[PDB]
Design a protein around this ligand. Structure first.
Ligand SMILES: *[C@@H]1O[C@H](CO)[C@@H](O[C@@H]2O[C@H](CO)[C@@H](O)[C@H](O)[C@H]2NC(C)=O)[C@H](O)[C@H]1NC(C)=O
Lengths: 85, 49, 92, 50
């Protein structure tokens, strides 16, 4: 009867009015969930690693960031000679 | 919202003068309590929008 | 996951100083040199080198804790309105 | 200006938003700063408006 219509209202006397206002509620909640998820999958983006050599993570070593170069190379000399590195 | 060359407003006087130390101490005391905050509320933080 | 209340905007707003013995003759030269360093931007370089945390202040918009008070309030509003309409139909 | 008036003896104290810097400190002595603030840029909201 009208029970299935309820389930289907989302897609398809005063009982029809109540069904209409309930369908409006259904549409508004679906739009709300859509906007929520759209903001969800946009805002989450971990850039973390900064392209810079001036990144604070590189300047301050920590357990979660491990970085190194080839031993006994030009990079080793370059990092050795500068006292601020 | 940017800022550069952060500096301060102080009170100028001549070379070594009797009022220097007490002026500095009074300013520090006013900073310690809320007097400078009261002045900021009265003159700077009163906005119309 | 740590943030400060605003940014130190209603508080004592003092500064770090170099303590010296009273009547020391180093005070004039030290204050002049500190003012020169502050004006030249070397102090800003030091702040960049040392007082710099993860990226910037990391506003990061909404990291977590989704807020949807408008949606639930509207939900309850519609349910109450519907039940009131049903009660009005009962009245007739 | 105010620096010249103070140094010439016309005044005994400058009670004004006078910025502390090394150029002025070589000739006069400032108190501890009663305000902390930097330089900034003033503009308008859009060409006419949003
Ligand atoms: C600066 O403030 C100090 C506060 O200690 C003043 O020193 C006192 O001055 C009164 C003047 O009547 C004397 O009776 C006290 O014996 C002083 N005490 C000390 C510890 O010095 C000082 O006079 C003030 N200077 C100026 C120029 O106002």
């Amino acid at each position: 009867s009208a029970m299935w219509f309820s389930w289907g209202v989302l897609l398809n006397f005063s009982a029809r009015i109540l069904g209409m206002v309930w369908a409006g509620f259904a549409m508004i909640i679906v739009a709300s969930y859509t906007a929520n998820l759209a903001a969800f999958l946009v805002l989450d983006r971990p850039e973390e690693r900064i392209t810079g050599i001036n990144d604070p993570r590189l300047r301050n070593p920590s357990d979660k960031f491990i970085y190194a170069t080839v031993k006994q190379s030009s990079v080793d000399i370059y990092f050795r000679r500068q006292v601020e590195l | 919202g940017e800022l550069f060359f952060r500096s301060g407003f102080g009170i100028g006087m001549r070379k070594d003068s009797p009022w220097k130390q007490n002026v500095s101490l009074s300013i520090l005391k006013s900073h310690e309590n809320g007097f400078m905050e009261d002045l900021d509320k009265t003159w700077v933080r009163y906005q119309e929008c | 996951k740590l943030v400060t209340i605003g940014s130190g905007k209603v508080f004592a707003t003092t500064g770090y100083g170099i303590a010296m013995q009273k009547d020391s003759h180093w005070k004039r030269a030290i204050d002049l040199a500190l003012l020169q360093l502050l004006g030249d931007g070397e102090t800003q370089k030091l702040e960049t080198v040392w007082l710099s945390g993860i990226c910037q202040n990391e506003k990061n918009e909404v990291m977590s804790s989704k807020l949807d008070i408008d949606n639930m309030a509207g939900v309850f509003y519609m349910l109450l309105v519907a039940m009131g309409l049903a009660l009005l139909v009962f009245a007739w | 200006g105010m620096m010249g008036e103070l140094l010439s003896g016309q005044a005994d104290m400058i009670v004004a938003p006078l910025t502390i810097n090394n150029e002025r400190a070589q000739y006069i002595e400032f108190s501890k700063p009663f305000k902390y603030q930097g330089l900034t840029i003033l503009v308008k909201k859009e060409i006419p408006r949003s």
